[PDB]
Coordinates of C-alpha atoms in Angstrom, one line a residue:
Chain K
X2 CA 0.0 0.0 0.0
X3 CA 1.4 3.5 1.0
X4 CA 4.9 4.3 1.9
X5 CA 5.5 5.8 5.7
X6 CA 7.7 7.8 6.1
X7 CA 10.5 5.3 7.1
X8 CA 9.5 2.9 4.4
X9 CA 10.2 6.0 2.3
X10 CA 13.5 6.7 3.6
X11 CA 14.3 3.3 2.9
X12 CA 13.2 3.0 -0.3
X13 CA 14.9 5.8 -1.6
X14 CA 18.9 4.2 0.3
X15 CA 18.2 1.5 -1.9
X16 CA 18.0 3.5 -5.1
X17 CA 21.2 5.8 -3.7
X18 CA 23.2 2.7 -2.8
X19 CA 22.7 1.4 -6.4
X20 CA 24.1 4.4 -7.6
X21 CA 27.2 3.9 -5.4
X22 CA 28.0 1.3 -6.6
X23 CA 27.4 2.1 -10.3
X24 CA 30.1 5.2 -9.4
X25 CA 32.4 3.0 -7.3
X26 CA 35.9 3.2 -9.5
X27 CA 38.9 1.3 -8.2
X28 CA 42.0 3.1 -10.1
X29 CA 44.3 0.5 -11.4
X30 CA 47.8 1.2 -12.9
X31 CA 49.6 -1.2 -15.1
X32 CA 50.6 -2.2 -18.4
X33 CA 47.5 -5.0 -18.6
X34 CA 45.1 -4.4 -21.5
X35 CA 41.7 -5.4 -19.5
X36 CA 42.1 -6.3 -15.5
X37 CA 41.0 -2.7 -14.5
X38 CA 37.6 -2.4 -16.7
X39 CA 37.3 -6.5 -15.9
X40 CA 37.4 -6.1 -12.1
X41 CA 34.1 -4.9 -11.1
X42 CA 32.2 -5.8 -14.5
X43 CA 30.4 -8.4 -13.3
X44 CA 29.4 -6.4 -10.1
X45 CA 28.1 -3.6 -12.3
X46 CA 26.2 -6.3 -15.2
X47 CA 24.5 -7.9 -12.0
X48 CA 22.1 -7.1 -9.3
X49 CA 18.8 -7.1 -8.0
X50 CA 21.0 -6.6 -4.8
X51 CA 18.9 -8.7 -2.5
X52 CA 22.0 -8.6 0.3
X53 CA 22.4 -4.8 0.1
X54 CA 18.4 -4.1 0.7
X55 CA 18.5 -7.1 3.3
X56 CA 21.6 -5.2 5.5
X57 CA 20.0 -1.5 4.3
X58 CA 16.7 -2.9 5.9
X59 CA 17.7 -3.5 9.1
X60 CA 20.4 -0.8 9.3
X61 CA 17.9 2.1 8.1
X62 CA 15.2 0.6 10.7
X63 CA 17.3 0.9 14.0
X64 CA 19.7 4.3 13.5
X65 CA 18.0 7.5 13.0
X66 CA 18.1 8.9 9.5
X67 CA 20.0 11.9 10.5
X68 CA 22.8 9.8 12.4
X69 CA 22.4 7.6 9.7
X70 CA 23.5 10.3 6.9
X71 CA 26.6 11.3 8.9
X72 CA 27.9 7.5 8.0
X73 CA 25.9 6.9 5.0
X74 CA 29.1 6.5 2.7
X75 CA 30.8 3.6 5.1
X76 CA 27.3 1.8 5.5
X77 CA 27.4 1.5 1.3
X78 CA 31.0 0.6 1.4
X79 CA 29.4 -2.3 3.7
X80 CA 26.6 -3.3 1.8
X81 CA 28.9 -3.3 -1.6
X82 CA 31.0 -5.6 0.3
X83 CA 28.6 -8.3 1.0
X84 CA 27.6 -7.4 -2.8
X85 CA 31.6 -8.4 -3.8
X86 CA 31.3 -11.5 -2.2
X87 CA 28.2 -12.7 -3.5
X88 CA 29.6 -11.5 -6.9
X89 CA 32.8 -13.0 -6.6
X90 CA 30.7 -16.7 -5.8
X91 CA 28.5 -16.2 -9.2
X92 CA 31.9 -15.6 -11.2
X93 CA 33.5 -18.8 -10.2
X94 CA 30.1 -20.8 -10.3
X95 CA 29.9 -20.1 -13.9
X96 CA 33.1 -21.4 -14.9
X97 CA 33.9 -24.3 -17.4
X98 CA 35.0 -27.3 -14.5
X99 CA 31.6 -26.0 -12.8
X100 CA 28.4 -24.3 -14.6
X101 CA 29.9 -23.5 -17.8
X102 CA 28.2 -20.4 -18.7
X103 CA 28.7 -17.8 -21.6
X104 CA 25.7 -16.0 -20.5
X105 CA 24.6 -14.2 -17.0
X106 CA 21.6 -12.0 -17.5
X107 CA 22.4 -12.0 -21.3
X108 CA 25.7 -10.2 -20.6
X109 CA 29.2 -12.3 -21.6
X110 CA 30.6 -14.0 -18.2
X111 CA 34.4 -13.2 -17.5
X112 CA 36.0 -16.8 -19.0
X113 CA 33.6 -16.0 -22.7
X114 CA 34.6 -12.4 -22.7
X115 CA 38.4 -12.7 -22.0
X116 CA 39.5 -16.3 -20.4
X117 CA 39.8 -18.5 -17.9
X118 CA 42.5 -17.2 -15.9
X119 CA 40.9 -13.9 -15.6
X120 CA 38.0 -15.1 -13.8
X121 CA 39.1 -16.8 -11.3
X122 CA 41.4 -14.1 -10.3
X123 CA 39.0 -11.6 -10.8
X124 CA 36.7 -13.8 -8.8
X125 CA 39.7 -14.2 -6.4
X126 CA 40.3 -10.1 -6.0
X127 CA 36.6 -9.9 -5.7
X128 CA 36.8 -12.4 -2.4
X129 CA 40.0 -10.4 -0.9
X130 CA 38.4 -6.5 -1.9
X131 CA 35.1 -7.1 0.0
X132 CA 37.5 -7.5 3.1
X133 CA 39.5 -5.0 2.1
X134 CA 36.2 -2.7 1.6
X135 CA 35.3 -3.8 5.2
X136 CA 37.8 -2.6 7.0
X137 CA 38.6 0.5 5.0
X138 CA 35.0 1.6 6.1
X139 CA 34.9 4.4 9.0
X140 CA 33.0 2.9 11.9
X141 CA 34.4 2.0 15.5
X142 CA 37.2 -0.7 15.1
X143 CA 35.1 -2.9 17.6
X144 CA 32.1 -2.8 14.7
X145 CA 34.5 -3.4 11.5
X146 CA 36.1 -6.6 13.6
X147 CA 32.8 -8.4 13.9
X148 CA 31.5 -7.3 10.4
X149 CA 34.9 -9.1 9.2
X150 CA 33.7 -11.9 11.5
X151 CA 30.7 -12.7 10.3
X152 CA 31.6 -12.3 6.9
X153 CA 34.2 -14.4 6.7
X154 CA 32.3 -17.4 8.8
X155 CA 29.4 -17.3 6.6
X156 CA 31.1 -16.6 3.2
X157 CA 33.7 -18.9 3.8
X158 CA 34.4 -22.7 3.9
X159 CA 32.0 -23.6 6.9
X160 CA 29.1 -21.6 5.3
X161 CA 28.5 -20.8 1.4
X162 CA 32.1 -21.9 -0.2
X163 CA 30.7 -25.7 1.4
X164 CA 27.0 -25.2 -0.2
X165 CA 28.7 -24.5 -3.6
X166 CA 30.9 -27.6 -3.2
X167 CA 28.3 -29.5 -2.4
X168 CA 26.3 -28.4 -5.4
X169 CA 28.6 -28.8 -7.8
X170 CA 29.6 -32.2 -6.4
X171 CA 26.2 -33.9 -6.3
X172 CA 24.9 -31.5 -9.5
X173 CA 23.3 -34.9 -11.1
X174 CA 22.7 -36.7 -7.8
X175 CA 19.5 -36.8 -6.3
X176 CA 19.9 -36.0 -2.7
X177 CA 17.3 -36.9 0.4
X178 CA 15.1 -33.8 2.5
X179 CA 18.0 -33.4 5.5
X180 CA 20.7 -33.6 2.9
X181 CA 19.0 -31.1 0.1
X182 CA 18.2 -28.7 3.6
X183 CA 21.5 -28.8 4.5
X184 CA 23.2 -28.0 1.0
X185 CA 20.5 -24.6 0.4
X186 CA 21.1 -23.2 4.1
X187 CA 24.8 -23.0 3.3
X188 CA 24.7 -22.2 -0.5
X189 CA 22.3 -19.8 0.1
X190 CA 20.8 -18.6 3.6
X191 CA 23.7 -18.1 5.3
X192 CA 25.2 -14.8 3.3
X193 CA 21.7 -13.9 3.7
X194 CA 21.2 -14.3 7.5
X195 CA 24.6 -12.6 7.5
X196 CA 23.4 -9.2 5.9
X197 CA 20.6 -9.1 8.1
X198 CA 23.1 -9.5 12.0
X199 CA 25.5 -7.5 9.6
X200 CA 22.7 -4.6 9.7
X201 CA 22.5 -4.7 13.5
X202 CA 26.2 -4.8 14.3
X203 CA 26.8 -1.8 11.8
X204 CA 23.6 -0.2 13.7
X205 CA 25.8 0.0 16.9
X206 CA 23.1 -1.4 19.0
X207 CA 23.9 -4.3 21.3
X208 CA 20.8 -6.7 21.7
X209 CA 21.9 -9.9 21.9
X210 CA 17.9 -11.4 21.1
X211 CA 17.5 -9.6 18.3
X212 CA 20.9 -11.0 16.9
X213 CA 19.5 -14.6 17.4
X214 CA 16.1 -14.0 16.2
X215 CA 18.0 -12.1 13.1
X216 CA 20.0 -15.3 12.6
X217 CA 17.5 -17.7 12.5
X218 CA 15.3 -15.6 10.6
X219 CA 17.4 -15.1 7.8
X220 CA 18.0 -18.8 7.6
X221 CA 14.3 -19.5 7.8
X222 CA 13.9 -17.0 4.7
X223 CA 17.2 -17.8 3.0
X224 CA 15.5 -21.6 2.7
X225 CA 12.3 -19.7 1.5
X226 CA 14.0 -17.8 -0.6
X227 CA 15.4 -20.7 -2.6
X228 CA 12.6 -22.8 -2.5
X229 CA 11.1 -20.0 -4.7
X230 CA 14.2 -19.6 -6.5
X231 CA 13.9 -23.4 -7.2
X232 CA 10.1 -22.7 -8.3
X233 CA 10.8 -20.0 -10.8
X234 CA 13.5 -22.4 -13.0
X235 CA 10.8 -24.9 -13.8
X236 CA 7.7 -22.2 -14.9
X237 CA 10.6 -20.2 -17.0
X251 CA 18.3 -31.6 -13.7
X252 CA 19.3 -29.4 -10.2
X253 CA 19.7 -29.8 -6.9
X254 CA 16.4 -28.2 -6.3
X255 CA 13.1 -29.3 -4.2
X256 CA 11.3 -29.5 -7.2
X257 CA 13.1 -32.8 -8.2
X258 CA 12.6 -34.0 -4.2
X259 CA 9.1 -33.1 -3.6
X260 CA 7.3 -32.6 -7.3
X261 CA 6.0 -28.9 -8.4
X262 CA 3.1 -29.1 -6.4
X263 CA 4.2 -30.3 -3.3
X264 CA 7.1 -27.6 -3.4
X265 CA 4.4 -25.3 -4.1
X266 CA 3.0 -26.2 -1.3
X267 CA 6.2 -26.1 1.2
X268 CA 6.7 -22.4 -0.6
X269 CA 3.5 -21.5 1.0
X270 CA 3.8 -23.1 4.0
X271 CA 7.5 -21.9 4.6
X272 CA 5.9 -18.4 3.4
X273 CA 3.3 -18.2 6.2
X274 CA 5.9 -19.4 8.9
X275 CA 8.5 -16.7 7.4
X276 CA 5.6 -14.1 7.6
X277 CA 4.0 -15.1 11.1
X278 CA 7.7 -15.1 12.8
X279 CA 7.9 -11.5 11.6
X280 CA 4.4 -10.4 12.9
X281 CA 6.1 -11.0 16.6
X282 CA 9.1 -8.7 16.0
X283 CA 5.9 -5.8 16.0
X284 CA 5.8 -4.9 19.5
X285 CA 9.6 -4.2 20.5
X286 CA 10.8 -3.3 16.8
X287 CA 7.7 -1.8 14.5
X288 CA 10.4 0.4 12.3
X289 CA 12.2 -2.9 11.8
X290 CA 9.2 -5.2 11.4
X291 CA 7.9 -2.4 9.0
X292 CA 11.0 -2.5 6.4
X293 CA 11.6 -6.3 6.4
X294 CA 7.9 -6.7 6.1
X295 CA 8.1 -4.9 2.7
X296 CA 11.1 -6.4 1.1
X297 CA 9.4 -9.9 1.8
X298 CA 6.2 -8.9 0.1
X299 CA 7.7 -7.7 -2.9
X300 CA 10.2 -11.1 -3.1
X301 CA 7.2 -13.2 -2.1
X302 CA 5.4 -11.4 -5.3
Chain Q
X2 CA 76.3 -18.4 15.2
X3 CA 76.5 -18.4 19.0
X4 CA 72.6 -17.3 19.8
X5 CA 71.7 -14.3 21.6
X6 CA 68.5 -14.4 24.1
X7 CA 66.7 -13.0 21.4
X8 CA 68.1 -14.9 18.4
X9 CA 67.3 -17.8 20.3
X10 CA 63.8 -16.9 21.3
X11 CA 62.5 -16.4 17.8
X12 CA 64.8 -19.5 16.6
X13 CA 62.1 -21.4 19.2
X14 CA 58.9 -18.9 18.4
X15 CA 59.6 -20.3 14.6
X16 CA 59.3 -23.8 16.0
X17 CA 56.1 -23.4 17.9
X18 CA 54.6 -21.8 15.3
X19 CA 55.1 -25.1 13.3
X20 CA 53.3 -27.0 15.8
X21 CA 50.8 -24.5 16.7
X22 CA 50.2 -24.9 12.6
X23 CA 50.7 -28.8 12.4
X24 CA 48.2 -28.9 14.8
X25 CA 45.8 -26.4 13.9
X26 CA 42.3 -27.9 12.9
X27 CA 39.1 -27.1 11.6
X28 CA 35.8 -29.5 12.2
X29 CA 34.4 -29.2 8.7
X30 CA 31.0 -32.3 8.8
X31 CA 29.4 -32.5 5.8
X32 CA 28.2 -35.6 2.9
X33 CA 31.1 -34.2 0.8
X34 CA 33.3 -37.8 0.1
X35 CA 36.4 -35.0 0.6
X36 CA 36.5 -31.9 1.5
X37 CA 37.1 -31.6 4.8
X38 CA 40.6 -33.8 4.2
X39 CA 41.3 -31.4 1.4
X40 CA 40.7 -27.9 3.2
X41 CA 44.0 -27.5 4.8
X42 CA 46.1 -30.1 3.0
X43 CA 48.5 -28.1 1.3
X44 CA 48.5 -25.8 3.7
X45 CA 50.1 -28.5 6.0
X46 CA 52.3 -29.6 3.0
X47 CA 53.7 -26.8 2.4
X48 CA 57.3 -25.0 2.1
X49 CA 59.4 -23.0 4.1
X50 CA 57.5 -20.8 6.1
X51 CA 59.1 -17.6 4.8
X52 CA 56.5 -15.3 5.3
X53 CA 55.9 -15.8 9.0
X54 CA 59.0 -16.1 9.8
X55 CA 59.6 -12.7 7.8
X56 CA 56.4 -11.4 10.6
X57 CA 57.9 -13.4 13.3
X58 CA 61.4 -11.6 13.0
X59 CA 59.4 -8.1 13.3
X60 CA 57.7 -9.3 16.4
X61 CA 60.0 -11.0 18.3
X62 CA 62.6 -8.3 17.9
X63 CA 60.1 -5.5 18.4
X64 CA 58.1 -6.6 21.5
X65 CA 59.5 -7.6 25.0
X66 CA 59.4 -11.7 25.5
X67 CA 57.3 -12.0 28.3
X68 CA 54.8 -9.9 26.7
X69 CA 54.8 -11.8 23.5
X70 CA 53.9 -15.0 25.6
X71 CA 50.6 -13.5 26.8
X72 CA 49.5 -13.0 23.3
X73 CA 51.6 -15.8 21.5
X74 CA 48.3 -18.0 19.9
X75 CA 47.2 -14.4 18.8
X76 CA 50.6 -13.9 17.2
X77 CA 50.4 -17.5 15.8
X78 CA 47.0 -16.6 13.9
X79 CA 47.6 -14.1 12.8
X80 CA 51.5 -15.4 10.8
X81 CA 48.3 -18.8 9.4
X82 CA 46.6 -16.1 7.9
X83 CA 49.6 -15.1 5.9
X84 CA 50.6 -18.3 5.2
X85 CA 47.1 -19.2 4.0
X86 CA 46.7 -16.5 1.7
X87 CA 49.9 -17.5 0.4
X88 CA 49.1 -21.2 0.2
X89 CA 45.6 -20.2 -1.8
X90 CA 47.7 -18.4 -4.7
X91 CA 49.7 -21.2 -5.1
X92 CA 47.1 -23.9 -5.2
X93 CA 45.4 -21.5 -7.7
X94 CA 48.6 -21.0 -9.9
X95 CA 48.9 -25.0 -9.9
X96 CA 45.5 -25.3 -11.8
X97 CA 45.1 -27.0 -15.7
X98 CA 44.0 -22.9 -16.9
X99 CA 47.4 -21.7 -15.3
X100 CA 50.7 -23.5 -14.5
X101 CA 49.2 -27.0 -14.9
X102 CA 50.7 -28.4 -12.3
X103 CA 50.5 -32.2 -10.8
X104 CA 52.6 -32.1 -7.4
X105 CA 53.7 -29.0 -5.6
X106 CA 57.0 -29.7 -3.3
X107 CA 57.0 -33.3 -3.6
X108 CA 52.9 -33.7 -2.6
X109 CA 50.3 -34.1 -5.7
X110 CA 48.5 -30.5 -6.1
X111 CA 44.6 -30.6 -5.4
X112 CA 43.1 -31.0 -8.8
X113 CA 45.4 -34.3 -9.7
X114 CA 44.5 -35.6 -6.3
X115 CA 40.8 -34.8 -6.1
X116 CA 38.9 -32.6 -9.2
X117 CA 39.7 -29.0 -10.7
X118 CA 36.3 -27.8 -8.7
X119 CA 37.7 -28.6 -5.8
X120 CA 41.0 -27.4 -5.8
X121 CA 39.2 -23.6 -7.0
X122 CA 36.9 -23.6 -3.8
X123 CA 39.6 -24.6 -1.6
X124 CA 41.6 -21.8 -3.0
X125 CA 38.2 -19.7 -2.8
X126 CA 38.1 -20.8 1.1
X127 CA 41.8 -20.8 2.1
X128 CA 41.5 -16.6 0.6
X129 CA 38.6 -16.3 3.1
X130 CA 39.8 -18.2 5.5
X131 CA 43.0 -15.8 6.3
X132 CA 40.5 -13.0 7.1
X133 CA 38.6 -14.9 9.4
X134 CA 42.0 -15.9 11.1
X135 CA 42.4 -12.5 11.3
X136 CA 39.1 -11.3 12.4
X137 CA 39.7 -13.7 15.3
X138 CA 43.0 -12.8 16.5
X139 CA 42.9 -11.3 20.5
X140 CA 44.5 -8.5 19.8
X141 CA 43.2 -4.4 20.1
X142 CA 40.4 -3.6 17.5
X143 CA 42.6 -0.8 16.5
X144 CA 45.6 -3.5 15.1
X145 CA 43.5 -6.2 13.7
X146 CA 41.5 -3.9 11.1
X147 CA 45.2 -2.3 10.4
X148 CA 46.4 -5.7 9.3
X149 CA 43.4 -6.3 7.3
X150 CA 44.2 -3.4 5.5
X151 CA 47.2 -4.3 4.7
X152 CA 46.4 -8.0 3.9
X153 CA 43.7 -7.1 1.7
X154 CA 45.4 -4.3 -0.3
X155 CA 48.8 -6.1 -0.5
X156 CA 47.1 -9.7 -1.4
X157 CA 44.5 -8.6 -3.7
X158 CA 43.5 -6.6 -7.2
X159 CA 46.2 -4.1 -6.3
X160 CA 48.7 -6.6 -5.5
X161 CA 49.7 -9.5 -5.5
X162 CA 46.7 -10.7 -8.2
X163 CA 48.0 -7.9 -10.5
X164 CA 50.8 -9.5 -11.1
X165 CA 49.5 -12.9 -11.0
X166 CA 47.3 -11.7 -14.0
X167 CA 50.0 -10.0 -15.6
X168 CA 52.1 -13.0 -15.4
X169 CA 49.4 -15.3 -16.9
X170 CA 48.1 -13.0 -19.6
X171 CA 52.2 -12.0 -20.5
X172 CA 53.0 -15.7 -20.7
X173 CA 53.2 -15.8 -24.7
X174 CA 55.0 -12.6 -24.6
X175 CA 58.7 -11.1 -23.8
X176 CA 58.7 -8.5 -21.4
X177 CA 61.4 -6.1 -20.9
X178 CA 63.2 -5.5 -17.2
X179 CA 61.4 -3.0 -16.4
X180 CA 58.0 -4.5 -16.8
X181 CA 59.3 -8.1 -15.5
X182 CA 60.3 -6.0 -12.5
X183 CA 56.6 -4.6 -11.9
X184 CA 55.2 -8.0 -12.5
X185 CA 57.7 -9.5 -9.5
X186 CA 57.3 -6.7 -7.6
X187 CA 53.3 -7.3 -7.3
X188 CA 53.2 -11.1 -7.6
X189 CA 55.7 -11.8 -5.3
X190 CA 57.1 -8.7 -3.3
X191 CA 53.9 -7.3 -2.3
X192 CA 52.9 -9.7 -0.1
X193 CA 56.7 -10.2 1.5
X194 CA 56.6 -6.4 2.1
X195 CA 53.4 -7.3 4.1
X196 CA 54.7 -9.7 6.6
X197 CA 57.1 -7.4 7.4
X198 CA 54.6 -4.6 7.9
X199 CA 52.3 -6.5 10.1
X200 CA 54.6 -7.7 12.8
X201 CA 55.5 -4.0 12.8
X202 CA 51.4 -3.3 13.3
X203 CA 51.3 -6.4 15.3
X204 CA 53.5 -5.5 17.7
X205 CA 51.6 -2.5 18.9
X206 CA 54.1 0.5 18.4
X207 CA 54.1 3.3 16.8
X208 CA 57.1 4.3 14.3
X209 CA 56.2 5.6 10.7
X210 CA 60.0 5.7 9.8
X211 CA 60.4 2.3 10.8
X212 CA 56.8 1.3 8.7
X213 CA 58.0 2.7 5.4
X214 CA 61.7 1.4 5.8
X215 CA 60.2 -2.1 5.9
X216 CA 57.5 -1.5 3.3
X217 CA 60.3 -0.4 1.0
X218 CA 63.2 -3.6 2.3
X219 CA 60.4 -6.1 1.8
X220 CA 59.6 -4.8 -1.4
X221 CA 63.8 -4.9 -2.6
X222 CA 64.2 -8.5 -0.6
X223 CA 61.1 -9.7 -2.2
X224 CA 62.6 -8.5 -5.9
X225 CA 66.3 -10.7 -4.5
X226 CA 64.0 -13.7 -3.5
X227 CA 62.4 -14.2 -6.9
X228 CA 65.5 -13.4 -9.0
X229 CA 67.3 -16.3 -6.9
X230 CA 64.1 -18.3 -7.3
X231 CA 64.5 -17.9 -11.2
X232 CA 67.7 -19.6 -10.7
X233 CA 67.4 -22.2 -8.9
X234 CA 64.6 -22.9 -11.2
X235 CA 67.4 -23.1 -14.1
X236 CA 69.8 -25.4 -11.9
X237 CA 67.3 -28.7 -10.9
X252 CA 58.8 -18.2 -19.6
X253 CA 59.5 -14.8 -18.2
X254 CA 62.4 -15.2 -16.2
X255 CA 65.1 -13.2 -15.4
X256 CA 67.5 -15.8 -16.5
X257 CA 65.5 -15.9 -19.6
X258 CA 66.1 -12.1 -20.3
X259 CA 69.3 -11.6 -18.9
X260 CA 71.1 -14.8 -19.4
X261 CA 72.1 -17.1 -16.4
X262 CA 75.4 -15.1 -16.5
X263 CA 74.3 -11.6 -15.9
X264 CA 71.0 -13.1 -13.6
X265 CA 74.0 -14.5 -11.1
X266 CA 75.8 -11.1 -11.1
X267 CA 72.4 -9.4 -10.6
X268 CA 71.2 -11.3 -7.6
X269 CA 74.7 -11.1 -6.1
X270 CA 74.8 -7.3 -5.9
X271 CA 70.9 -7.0 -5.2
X272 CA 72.1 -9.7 -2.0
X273 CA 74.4 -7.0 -1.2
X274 CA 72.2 -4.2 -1.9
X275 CA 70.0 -5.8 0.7
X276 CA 72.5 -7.0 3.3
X277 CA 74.0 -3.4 3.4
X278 CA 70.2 -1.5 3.4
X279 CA 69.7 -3.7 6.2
X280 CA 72.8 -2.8 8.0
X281 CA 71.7 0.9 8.9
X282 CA 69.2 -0.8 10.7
X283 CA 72.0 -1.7 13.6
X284 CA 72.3 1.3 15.5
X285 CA 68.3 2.5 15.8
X286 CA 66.9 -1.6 16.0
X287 CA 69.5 -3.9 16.8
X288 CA 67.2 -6.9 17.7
X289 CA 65.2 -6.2 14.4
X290 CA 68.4 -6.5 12.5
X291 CA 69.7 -9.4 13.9
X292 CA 66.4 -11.4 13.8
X293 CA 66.3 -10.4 9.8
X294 CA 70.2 -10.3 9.3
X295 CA 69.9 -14.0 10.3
X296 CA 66.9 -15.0 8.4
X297 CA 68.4 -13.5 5.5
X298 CA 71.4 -15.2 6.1
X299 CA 69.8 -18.3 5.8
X300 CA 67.7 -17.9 2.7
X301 CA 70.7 -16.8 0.9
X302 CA 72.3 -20.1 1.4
X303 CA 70.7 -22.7 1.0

């Protein structure tokens, strides 16, 4: 329906932190013909920025928006590094040993447009900058430590580097309900539940029940999340619940999951309405 | 060589840290046939430990003994994280699109032993995996983030990827001195220069001189290092003995060896540990 004021507010980061990113310009001196121009390519070709809004929700919800707008530049530096990373994971998924695509939303992938090598040291530099975009952000050291912490946990080999394995491991292997659970929550929800506990330790507030209900809500959605993701490839071979459950069963779990996701959320009203209000939104317009 | 108290200590510090690494161990349970076995494989079969003990030598000099021991595990994860970073690009150079490699030392490299895929998100997770190291270290908020900072900016795009690109791209072409130099200088020196650097951060105090007098060593012994690693190489491409000759490259690397022994001599009256400590190390390297 219609946008409050602080669903307004929000909005409107969302559309500035895109253009951030679109002006971002790492200045690269040397006698190679392409690595410069190459570097953040894919990050500029891709984006619906699901991570970004996910961290900008929470974040925008819980500081003030004129406290906010004194750090507003070190909050995008933030969000663009959790976009990096998730970049940096599509550019080595789509390479010939794994995916081997040309394409990624009709634009060349790295490997098609120059070669192998590049990509996965572009994907490579892409990994190492979002750290290095971490802690060159201007918070309190105590905040960039922890963001660098989470990060690297959930982005790393215990968290989505082991999803991808997985996937590309078992890509023509049908694999049971626990198994198939197990492989999404790490490919997927965990950089997802990440941006959201990401948005409260950037916020500079210290609730320690909020953090856990964050982290197990973005898990809970990062499973829903890909259980529509699964959903959409069929209407438009994988590890996906489709091939587990049939189309109308996951249809059904989608919906169920959906509810859950949404009901979970309708508790967080009392002590965090701004919050509630902003996460709310970005649901609807995913769950649509 | 009859060992000072401090040449001594740091003789022993470079010892622990070879058990505290042997013995390091990450819990990694998943339906993956390998993964966990393959995560930090090469890191324990790998070489010569150069970079920490270039970051050991800082420290040890630098900070008073007993006060090393209270933090020593915090020292110690920080010097893996170098190492592991390190250990990523190499089992990333080994790969079929790069050097094509089937053992590294004496051990079989990560794509002959298991797949390609695997050996790329190994490399994907060792990179990630140094930042979380990091990220975890016990040390004031302050240093850590410093160190990422210089991780991040000496390992990555700017660094030491550069001239890994530059070296892959430039592989089917003869490059002149002065470019082979900037390749060297990024693919290998960069990250040498940084070791150095962050057992200066490391070590808590505060000395700007001293910060860009290592920078600039690391970056010269880093140069001396790969010029004597391009002949060895020639004794059991764009090399130097390929450009120069192995006549002028053996000239070359004995008067940069002296360059560097007699830069690092002025060190003796204002840091007499820190000499001694690198003197030593240096020593050593340029035997054999």
């Amino acid at each position: 329906s219609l946008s409050s004021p602080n669903l307004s507010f929000y909005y409107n980061e969302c559309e500035r932190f895109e253009s951030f990113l679109k002006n971002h310009h790492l200045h690269l001196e040397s006698f190679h013909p392409y690595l410069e121009k190459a570097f953040f390519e894919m990050v500029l070709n891709g984006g619906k920025r699901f991570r970004p809004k996910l961290f900008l929700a929470v974040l925008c919800a819980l500081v003030g928006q004129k406290d906010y707008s004194n750090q507003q530049t070190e909050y995008f530096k933030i969000a663009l590094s959790i976009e990096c990373l998730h970049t940096y994971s599509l550019i080595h998924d789509d390479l010939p040993c794994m995916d081997n695509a040309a394409l990624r939303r009709n634009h060349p992938t790295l490997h098609a447009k120059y070669d192998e090598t590049t990509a996965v040291l572009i994907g490579d530099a892409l990994n190492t900058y979002s750290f290095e975009l971490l802690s060159n952000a201007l918070l309190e050291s105590h905040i960039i430590v922890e963001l660098i912490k989470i990060l690297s946990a959930n982005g790393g080999i215990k968290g989505m580097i082991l999803g991808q394995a997985l996937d590309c491991y078992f890509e023509n292997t049908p694999l049971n309900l626990e198994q198939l659970t197990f492989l999404h929550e790490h490919k997927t929800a965990k950089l997802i539940s990440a941006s959201l506990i990401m948005g409260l330790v950037a916020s500079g507030i210290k609730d320690e029940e909020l953090f856990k209900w964050l982290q197990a809500f973005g898990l809970k959605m990062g499973l829903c999340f890909q259980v529509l993701d699964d959903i959409i490839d069929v209407t438009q071979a994988k590890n996906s619940f489709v091939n587990l459950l049939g189309l109308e069963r996951a249809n059904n779990y989608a919906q169920t999951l959906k509810t859950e996701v949404l009901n979970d959320l309708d508790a967080l009203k009392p002590a965090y309405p701004l919050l509630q209000e902003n996460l709310n939104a970005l649901l609807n317009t995913l769950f649509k």
